[PDB]
Design a protein around this ligand. Structure first.
Ligand code: Y01
Ligand code: Y01
Ligand code: Y01
Ligand code: LMT
Ligand code: JC9
Ligand code: NAG
Ligand code: D12
Ligand code: D12
Ligand code: D12
Ligand code: D12
Ligand code: D12
Ligand code: D12
Ligand code: D10
Ligand code: D10
Ligand code: DD9
Ligand code: DD9
Ligand code: DD9
Ligand code: DD9
Ligand code: DD9
Ligand code: OCT
Ligand code: OCT
Ligand code: OCT
Ligand code: OCT
Ligand code: OCT
Ligand code: CL
Ligand code: NA
Ligand code: NA
Length: 540
C-alpha cells in the first residue's frame, strides 16, 4: 500500500510551502508596481478565480482519485498522453538546476551576515572598486551616472564575481564558495526528502511556517518606519488606465499560473498520498487562498521597506527598484536592511526567510519527480527510494554546476525565462484537455462525487471544460508571439541566446509528440484503431 500523509496538516503545509516560494516575494511586488498597482489586483483575482484555482483543484482531485504520479495516471486517463509525465520530469531538471543556486546566493549572503557590520554597508573592501560614492547621502553626495551602490558591488563582484565573466559567451571559472553553499543545500534537500512523505511531511512544519514567523517580524519592522506610507501608497495606488492594456491581464495570468503551479506535476504527487475520502475541495480552496494572501502580504513588506529607503534618500521611487530580478532581494532590499537600526538581526532573519522559502519548493519539485518515477516503474526502485533520491539530487547538482560559474547569473536568467515558459503552459494545457475532453468531465465529476460526496458545481465544470484551457491558451499564444529581449547587469543577450532558449523549451515539450508517435506506431491495428484504443484508459 502507498504511504498516506500520516496527518492532514502535513499535506496542507506541504502544498502551502510548495505554492509560496522565492519568486512571489520579489516578483509579485515588482509586477504589481510595473503593471498598474491596486488596479492589478482586479486582474489577479479574475485570473485566479477562473484560472489557477480550478486547475489547482482539478489536479488535486485527479491525483487523489487515481493514486498515481504524473507518468502513471495517464494509464487510466488517456494512454496516449503518457509522454506528458516525461516532459514534466525534464522541466524539473531545468528548474532544479537554477532555482537551487538562487538559494545558494541567499545562503552566501546569510554567511556574510554574521558580522558586527554587514559587509555590504561600507565600500572600502577589496571587491569594491571606484564608482562607489558610498550611497545614502553619506558624507559628500556626488551621485553620478557612473557611481554604483556598495550593495551592487557586493552582489555583482563578491557573491557573483560576474565581472570576471565577459558574458554568456565565456562563463569563465567556477565559484568554490557558491559550490560549497549549494552542496550544503542539496545535502539538506536530499536528507529531507529521502525517506519519502513521512519525513518530508514533518520537515515542512518548520520550513513552511518559519517564513510566516519571519514575515510578521519584517512587516512589524517595516511598517513602523519613516516613509512607510509612501511605500504602501505607491503599492496600492490604482493606475486604472493600465487595465486597458492587454499586457496587464497577460501578466496577471502568468503570475497566477506560475505562483499556484497547477501543471508542474507536483500537486498530483502530493495529493496521491491523501486518503481516498479526503476533501480536496476544501484543501484546494484553502491552499490557494493562502498562496494569494501570502503574495499580497509579502508585497506589503517589500514595498514598505522600499518606501522607507526611498524616503531616506529624499528621492522618488521607480528609480530605487531599477533591477527586475533576484537583484531586488540582494541589491535593493539588502541595502535597505543594512540601513535599519538592528541591521544584523534583520539581515540574518531575511535571508533565513529566503532559504526556507525556496527549500519547500525544491522539496516539492524533486519529490514530484521522485513519486512519478517511483510509481511508473514500481518493480525497480521499490526498496530503494533512497538511492533514487540520491541519483535525482546528484543529477540536479551536476546540472547546477554551470549556474555556479562566474557567468552564473546569465545562465540563471536564461533558465529562468525559458524552461518555465510555453513548455510548462503547454504541458498543463494538454493535461487539462486530456482530462476534461478525452476522459470526459462527466466521468471526472462522477469520480469527484464518489470521493467528496457532492458532484462539482456548474462553475467547476464550466471552468474545467472551457475557461481554463482558454486561459492557458491565452498565456501560451501571448508568450510565443512576443519574444523577450533579455538583459541583465548591462549585458544585452546575443542573437543565439533566443535560439538556445527555444531549444531549451523544445527539449521539454518534445516528450509529448514523441511518445504520441511511439504509441501510435507500435500499437497493432488500422488507421483509426490506433487512436481509438490508445485514447481509452487501459483495463486494470
Ligand atoms: C504573513 C503573515 C503576516 C501572516 C501569518 C499567517 C500565518 C499565521 C497562517 C497562514 C497559513 C496558516 C496555516 C495554514 C494551514 C494550517 C493547517 C491547519 O491544520 C488543520 O487542518 C487542523 C484543523 C483542525 O482540526 O482544527 C492548522 C493551522 C495551519 C498550520 C495554519 C496556521 C497559521 C498560518 C501559518
Ligand atoms: C477585497 C477585500 C474585502 C478582501 C477580501 C477578499 C476575499 C473575501 C475573496 C477574494 C478572492 C476570493 C476567493 C477567490 C475564488 C474563490 C472560488 C470560489 O468558488 C466557487 O464556488 C465560486 C462560485 C461562483 O463564482 O459562482 C470559492 C471562493 C474563493 C476561494 C474565494 C474566497 C474568498 C476570496 C479570498
Ligand atoms: C562525505 C561527502 C564528501 C560525500 C557525500 C556522499 C553522499 C552521496 C552519501 C554519503 C552518505 C550517504 C547516505 C548514507 C547511507 C545510505 C544508505 C543507503 O541504503 C539504503 O537504501 C538504506 C535503506 C534503509 O534505510 O534501510 C541509501 C543511501 C544512504 C541513505 C546515503 C544517501 C547519500 C549519502 C549522503
Ligand atoms: C506549444 C509549443 C511550444 C513548446 C515550447 C516552445 C518553446 C518556446 C519558448 C519561447 C520562450 C518565451 O518565453 C517566455 O517569454 C515571455 C515573453 O514575455 C517572457 O515572460 C516574461 O514576460 C511576461 C509577460 O508577458 C511576464 O509573465 C514576465 O515578466 C516574464 O515571464 C519569458 O521569457 C518566458 O515566459
Ligand atoms: C517555478 N516555481 C515553482 C517550482 C516548482 C517546482 C520546483 C521548483 C519551483 Cl521554484 C513552480 C510552481 C509554483 C511555485 C514554485 O516555486
Ligand atoms: C567608472 O566606470 C567607468 C566605466 O564603467 C570608468 O571609465 C571610470 O573610470 C570609473 N570611475 C572610477 C572612479 O573608477
Ligand atoms: C468588486 C470586486 C473587486 C475585487 C477587487 C479586489 C482588489 C481591490 C483592492 C482595493 C482597491 C484599491
Ligand atoms: C532531475 C532528473 C530526474 C530524473 C532522474 C535521472 C537519473 C535517475 C538515475 C539514473 C542513474 C542511475
Ligand atoms: C517536527 C518538526 C521537524 C523539524 C525538522 C527536523 C528536526 C530534527 C531535530 C533533531 C535532530 C537535530
Ligand atoms: C484563504 C482563506 C480561506 C478561504 C476559504 C476556505 C474555505 C474553507 C471552508 C470554511 C470557511 C469558513
Ligand atoms: C515506453 C516509452 C517510450 C518513449 C519513447 C520516446 C520518449 C520521449 C523521447 C524524447 C527525448 C527524450
Ligand atoms: C505520428 C504517428 C503515426 C505515424 C504514421 C506515419 C505518419 C507519416 C506522415 C507524417 C510525417 C510528419
Ligand atoms: C458554487 C458553485 C456554483 C455557482 C453558481 C453557478 C451558476 C450561477 C448562476 C447562473
Ligand atoms: C530509432 C528509434 C528512435 C525513437 C523513435 C520514436 C518513434 C518515431 C516515430 C516516427
Ligand atoms: C523519467 C524516465 C525517462 C525514460 C525516457 C524513455 C525514453 C526512451 C528513448
Ligand atoms: C543537514 C541535515 C542532515 C541530517 C542527517 C542526520 C545524520 C545523523 C547521523
Ligand atoms: C530520518 C532522518 C531525517 C532527517 C531530517 C533532516 C531535515 C533537514 C532539514
Ligand atoms: C499541528 C501543526 C503545528 C505546526 C507548528 C509548527 C511551528 C514551527 C515554528
Ligand atoms: C548511488 C547512486 C548514484 C548515481 C548517480 C548518478 C549521476 C548521474 C549524473
Ligand atoms: C575552484 C574550486 C572548484 C570546486 C568545484 C569543483 C568540483 C565539484
Ligand atoms: C467536449 C469538447 C471537446 C473539444 C471539441 C472539439 C471540436 C472539434
Ligand atoms: C476531443 C475528442 C473527444 C473524444 C471523447 C471520447 C469519444 C466519445
Ligand atoms: C459537459 C459538462 C457541462 C459543460 C458545460 C459547458 C462547457 C462549455
Ligand atoms: C455555465 C452555466 C451553464 C448552466 C446550464 C445548466 C443549468 C442546469
Ligand atoms: Cl502571487
Ligand atoms: Na507563489
Ligand atoms: Na516554501
Amino acid at each position: 500500500e502507498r504511504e498516506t500523509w500520516g496527518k492532514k496538516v502535513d499535506f496542507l503545509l506541504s502544498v502551502i510551502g510548495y505554492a509560496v516560494d522565492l519568486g512571489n516575494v520579489w516578483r509579485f511586488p515588482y509586477i504589481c508596481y510595473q503593471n498598474g498597482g491596486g488596479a492589478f489586483l482586479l486582474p489577479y483575482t479574475i485570473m485566479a478565480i477562473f484560472g489557477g484555482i480550478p486547475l489547482f483543484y482539478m489536479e488535486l482531485a485527479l491525483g487523489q482519485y487515481h493514486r498515481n504520479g504524473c507518468i502513471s495516471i495517464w494509464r487510466k486517463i488517456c494512454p496516449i498522453f503518457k509522454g506528458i509525465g516525461y516532459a514534466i520530469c525534464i522541466i524539473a531538471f531545468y528548474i532544479a538546476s537554477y532555482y537551487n543556486t538562487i538559494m545558494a546566493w541567499a545562503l552566501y549572503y546569510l554567511i556574510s551576515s554574521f558580522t558586527d557590520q554587514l559587509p555590504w554597508t561600507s565600500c572600502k573592501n577589496s571587491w569594491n572598486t571606484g564608482n562607489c560614492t558610498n550611497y545614502f547621502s553619506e558624507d559628500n553626495i556626488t551621485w553620478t551616472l557612473h557611481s554604483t551602490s556598495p550593495a551592487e558591488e557586493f552582489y555583482t563582484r563578491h557573491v557573483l564575481q560576474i565581472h570576471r565573466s565577459k558574458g554568456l559567451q565565456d562563463l569563465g571559472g567556477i565559484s568554490w564558495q557558491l559550490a560549497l553553499c549549494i552542496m550544503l543545500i542539496f545535502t539538506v534537500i536530499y536528507f529531507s526528502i529521502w525517506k519519502g512523505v513521512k519525513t518530508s511531511g514533518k520537515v515542512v512544519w518548520v520550513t513552511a511556517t518559519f517564513p510566516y514567523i519571519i514575515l510578521s517580524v519584517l512587516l512589524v519592522r517595516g511598517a513602523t518606519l519613516p516613509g512607510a506610507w509612501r511605500g504602501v501608497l505607491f503599492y496600492l495606488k490604482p493606475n486604472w488606465q493600465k487595465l486597458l492594456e492587454t499586457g496587464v491581464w497577460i501578466d496577471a495570468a502568468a503570475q497566477i499560473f506560475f505562483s499556484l503551479g497547477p501543471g508542474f506535476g507536483v500537486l498530483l504527487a502530493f495529493a496521491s498520498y491523501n486518503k481516498f475520502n479526503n476533501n480536496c475541495y476544501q484543501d484546494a480552496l484553502v491552499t490557494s487562498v493562502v498562496n494569494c494572501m501570502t503574495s499580497f502580504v509579502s508585497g506589503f513588506v517589500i514595498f514598505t521597506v522600499l518606501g522607507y529607503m526611498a524616503e531616506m534618500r529624499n528621492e522618488d521611487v521607480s528609480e530605487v527598484a531599477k533591477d527586475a530580478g533576484p537583484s531586488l532581494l540582494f541589491i535593493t532590499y539588502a541595502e535597505a536592511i543594512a540601513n535599519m537600526p538592528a541591521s544584523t538581526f534583520f539581515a540574518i532573519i531575511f535571508f533565513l526567510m529566503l532559504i526556507t522559502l525556496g527549500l519547500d519548493s525544491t522539496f516539492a519539485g524533486l519529490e514530484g519527480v521522485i513519486t512519478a518515477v517511483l510509481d511508473e516503474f514500481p518493480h525497480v526502485w521499490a526498496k530503494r527510494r533512497e538511492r533514487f533520491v540520491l541519483a535525482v539530487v546528484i543529477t540536479c547538482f551536476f546540472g547546477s554546476l554551470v549556474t555556479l560559474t562566474f557567468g552564473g547569473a546569465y545562465v540563471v536568467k536564461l533558465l529562468e525565462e525559458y524552461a518555465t515558459g510555453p513548455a510548462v503552459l503547454t504541458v498543463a494545457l494538454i493535461e487539462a484537455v486530456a482530462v476534461s475532453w478525452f476522459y470526459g468531465i462527466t466521468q471526472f465529476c462522477r469520480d469527484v462525487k464518489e470521493m467528496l460526496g457532492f458532484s462539482p458545481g456548474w462553475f467547476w465544470r464550466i471552468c474545467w471544460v472551457a475557461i481554463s484551457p482558454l486561459f492557458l491558451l491565452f498565456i501560451i499564444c501571448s508568450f510565443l508571439m512576443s519574444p523577450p529581449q533579455l538583459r541583465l547587469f548591462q549585458y544585452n543577450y546575443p542573437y543565439w541566446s533566443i535560439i538556445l532558449g527555444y531549444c531549451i523549451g523544445t527539449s521539454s515539450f518534445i516528450c509529448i509528440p514523441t511518445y504520441i508517435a511511439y504509441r501510435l506506431i507500435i500499437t497493432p491495428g488500422t488507421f483509426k484503431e490506433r487512436i481509438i484504443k490508445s485514447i481509452t484508459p487501459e483495463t486494470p
